[PDB]
């Protein structure tokens, strides 16, 4: 296995979009940064806030970027190249469309799906080295022209709770994705209600 020794949460920075769709990977960030006590720093070096903890002798790091949603890989590329991460030890905890809230799932590699920010992410790392993925469902408006103001809206209610218990159980399987074993790690998850 491959040990994970960078955790990245996507969302736009400032309260414009703060609790919006589109920060469900910050937010999941957020959560573990707080349930392992680490306190995420401001650092312009990395063009985010950073964060680390230790785990079976390594340091595991938090990013949540920001710059734009657009530029995220930015803030990627600076922090794993200065300390030598490869894409296979990242993680990147991003909303996804495709899941309707209450639902998360893990993936290796493939598309961007029209996400921006994983979009360059792939682009600042590159199409030969995969990273991984946890798939944060905030559910689909129905139509193409309608993405751009729903994942930069703020859902109601009962689909933040969703959106809440999808990322405690995604928590739940911290061990294995530290370890870097996906196949438990999508074993546990995935069978989750």
Do not use: C
């Amino acid at each position: 296995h491959t040990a994970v020794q960078l955790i990245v949460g996507l969302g736009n920075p400032g309260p414009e979009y703060d609790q919006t769709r589109h920060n469900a990977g910050a937010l999941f960030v957020e959560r573990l940064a707080h349930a392992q006590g680490v306190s995420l720093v401001a650092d312009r070096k990395y063009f985010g806030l950073v964060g680390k903890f230790s785990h079976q002798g390594k340091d595991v790091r938090l990013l949540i970027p920001t710059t734009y949603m657009n530029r995220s890989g930015q803030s990627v590329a600076a922090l794993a190249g200065f300390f030598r991460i490869a894409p296979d030890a990242i993680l990147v905890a991003h909303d996804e469309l495709d899941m309707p809230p209450g639902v998360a799932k893990l993936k290796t590699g493939g598309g961007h799906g029209g996400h921006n920010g994983l979009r360059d992410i792939i682009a600042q790392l590159g199409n030969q080295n995969s990273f991984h993925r946890l798939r944060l469902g905030i559910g689909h408006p129905g139509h193409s022209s309608l993405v751009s103001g729903y994942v930069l809206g703020r859902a109601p209610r009962s689909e933040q709770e969703l959106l809440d218990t999808s990322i405690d159980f995604a928590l739940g399987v911290l061990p294995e994705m530290l370890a870097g074993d996906w196949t438990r790690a999508m074993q546990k998850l995935h069978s989750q209600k």
